[PDB]
Amino acid sequence: QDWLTFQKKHITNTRDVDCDNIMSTNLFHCKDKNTFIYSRPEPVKAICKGIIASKNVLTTSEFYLSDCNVTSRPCKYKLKKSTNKFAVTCENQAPVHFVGVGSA
């Protein structure tokens, strides 16, 4: 989509996110699982340096990222708080898509 709205979708202001509450917003619209990126926008975009075409890149740094995984309970979750690097799809040297946490 775009660099700015990607922030609205995955860039949050809190490491301790009430994702359990947030999910009632159509943004998450009672999702099963979503990771967030608690970061400044600039550090995030820096991963995409050199990336013109749309392709995913792995973060060189570790970021404060949490995964809301829905339990057996309907739209109720567990929070998994992690600090790791992530993969994002960059285009025009801007992250627009989140691929997921998973790396060495």
Return the domain boundaries, the chain: 2-104
Is 10 considered catalytic here?
A: yes
CA distance 26 to 28: 5
Annotated binding-site residue? 34: yes
Whether residue 9 is annotated as binding a ligand: the answer is no
56 is in an annotated binding site: no
Burial of 10 (0-12, 13-18, 19+ CB in 10 A): buried
List the beta bridge partners of residue 56.
Answer: 89
Q: Find where tokens 């890149």 sit.
A: 57
CATH for 2-104 is 3.10.130.10
- Would strands 11-12 and 37-38 be described as parallel, antiparallel, or unpaired? parallel
- CA–CA separation, 21 and 14 (whole Å): 13
Q: Is the CB of residue 79 less than 8 Å from the CB of residue 20?
A: yes
Query: Does the active-site annotation cover 29?
Result: no
Please tell me the distance from the alpha carbon of residue 46 to that of residue 97, in angstroms, as a whole number.
14
